[PDB]
């Protein structure tokens, strides 16, 4: 029984170490600063904006698109199409032309 | 750990069993030694003969 | 079955710490006491010859009673001898069976306490140990020869 109690104490020291470490990890995750920032951004949208973003969230996650990879790739694609294709003078000169 | 609590309790029980059985062995040894003493007294009586 | 919520197992194999304790487990050598007895009885025989008046009869009952006494004493010695032999054989068998049984850890603690693992129990085996019998009754001393023949020699 002496040996048995020693072994039990060792095994439960290991289990307590693991459980405490992961409980601390969860406490870090509850609430993680990234988690808090993402929640703040999510709740920062207005009514219609948050509704539309939630609908697009459903769309992307149905496609699996809702990830940093796809979102960032779309960002970079639009950035490449905008910066390379450099964009009242036109409208006013057109009006002068027409008159 | 809840299990370990009964482990400690019945470990104390085991130690008590050890102590009691050792004491019983000692007492039976004492009684047997007293029987031996009686046998030695009878030895001495025989020499008187 | 009522499992052991009492973690003390019903039976456990030989723990080495008590393996040492088990080495000290033995019947005490009482043969010295028996030799003292046998010497005293031989002296009793010699003095019984020395004192008893050859003209007086009535020693047959003395010799018969001491004959029965010495047979009883030799029987006791033999019982102790067979007890020691049974202790030796029991110890050998218990060690072999216990070592054949898994040693004790927390897992085997639960198995042994719940009856999943069963090992020889020296208390149980000692109960199952053969009862001390007269093993080589010490009758070969000159003591029983005279205690047997002396009634007739007195006649």
UniProtKB/Swiss-Prot annotation, chain A:
Compartments, record wording: Nucleus; Chromosome
Domain of life: Eukaryota
PTM description: Sumoylated by MMS21.
Miscellaneous field: Present with 892 molecules/cell in log phase SD medium.
Quaternary structure and partners: Component of the Smc5-Smc6 complex which consists of KRE29, MMS21, NSE1, NSE3, NSE4, NSE5, SMC5 and SMC6.
Function: Acts in a DNA repair pathway for removal of UV-induced DNA damage that is distinct from classical nucleotide excision repair and in repair of ionizing radiation damage. Functions in homologous recombination repair of DNA double strand breaks and in recovery of stalled replication forks.
Recorded domain comment: The flexible hinge domain, which separates the large intramolecular coiled coil regions, allows the heterotypic interaction with the corresponding domain of smc6, forming a V-shaped heterodimer.
Family according to the record: Belongs to the SMC family. SMC5 subfamily.
Protein's name according to its UniProt entry: Structural maintenance of chromosomes protein 5
Organism: Saccharomyces cerevisiae (strain ATCC 204508 / S288c) (Baker's yeast)
Span within the parent record: 796 to 895 of 1093
UniProtKB/Swiss-Prot annotation, chain C:
Principal subcellular localization: nucleus
The UniProt record lists the keyword Magnesium: no
UniProt subcellular location: Nucleus; Cytoplasm
EC identifiers of the protein: 2.3.2.-
A biological process from GO: chromatin looping
UniProt pathway: Protein modification; protein sumoylation
Top-rank EC class of the record's enzyme: transferase
Domain of life according to the entry: Eukaryota
One Gene Ontology term, aspect cellular component: chromosome, telomeric region
Keywords assigned by UniProt, alphabetized: Cytoplasm, DNA damage, DNA recombination, DNA repair, Metal-binding, Nucleus, Transferase, Ubl conjugation pathway, Zinc, Zinc-finger
GO molecular function: protein serine/threonine kinase inhibitor activity; SUMO ligase activity; SUMO transferase activity; zinc ion binding
Stated role: Acts as an E3 ligase mediating SUMO/Smt3 attachment to SMC5 and YKU70. Acts in a DNA repair pathway for removal of UV-induced DNA damage that is distinct from classical nucleotide excision repair and in repair of ionizing radiation damage. Functions in homologous recombination repair of DNA double strand breaks and in recovery of stalled replication forks.
Similarity section: Belongs to the NSE2 family.
Subunit and interaction comment: Component of the Smc5-Smc6 complex which consists of KRE29, NSE1, NSE2/MMS21, NSE3, NSE4, NSE5, SMC5 and SMC6.
Additional information: Present with 2800 molecules/cell in log phase SD medium.
The protein's name in its UniProt record: E3 SUMO-protein ligase MMS21
Species name: Saccharomyces cerevisiae (strain ATCC 204508 / S288c) (Baker's yeast)
Residues of the full protein shown: 2 to 155 of 267
């Amino acid at each position: 029984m002496n040996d048995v109690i020693g072994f039990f104490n060792e095994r439960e020291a290991d289990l307590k170490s693991q459980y405490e470490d992961k409980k601390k990890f969860v406490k870090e995750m509850r609430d993680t600063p990234e988690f808090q920032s993402w929640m703040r951004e999510i709740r920062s949208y207005d009514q219609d904006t948050k509704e539309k973003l939630n609908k697009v969230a459903e769309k992307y996650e149905e496609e699996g698109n809702f990830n940093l990879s796809f979102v960032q790739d779309v960002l970079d694609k639009l950035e490449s199409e905008i910066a390379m294709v450099n964009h009242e003078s036109a409208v006013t000169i057109l009006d002068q032309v027409t008159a | 750990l809840k299990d370990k609590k009964p482990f400690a309790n019945t470990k104390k029980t085991l130690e008590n069993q050890v102590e009691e059985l050792t004491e019983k062995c000692s007492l039976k040894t004492d009684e047997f030694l007293k029987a031996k003493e009686k046998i030695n007294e009878i030895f001495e009586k025989l020499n008187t003969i | 079955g009522a499992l052991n919520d009492n973690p003390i197992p019903k039976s456990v194999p030989l723990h080495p710490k008590s393996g040492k304790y088990f080495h000290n487990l033995h019947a005490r050598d009482l043969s010295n006491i028996y030799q003292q007895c046998y010497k005293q009885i031989d002296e009793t025989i010699n003095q019984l010859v020395d004192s008893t008046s050859p003209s007086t009869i009535g020693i047959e009952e003395q010799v018969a009673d001491i004959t029965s006494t010495y047979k009883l004493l030799s029987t006791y010695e033999s019982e102790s001898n067979s007890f020691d032999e049974h202790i030796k054989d029991l110890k050998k068998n218990f060690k072999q069976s216990s070592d054949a049984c898994p040693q004790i850890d927390l897992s085997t603690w639960d198995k042994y306490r719940t009856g999943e693992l069963t090992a020889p129990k020296l208390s149980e085996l000692y109960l199952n140990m053969p009862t001390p019998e007269p093993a080589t009754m010490v009758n070969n001393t000159d003591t029983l020869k005279i205690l047997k023949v002396l009634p007739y020699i007195w006649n």
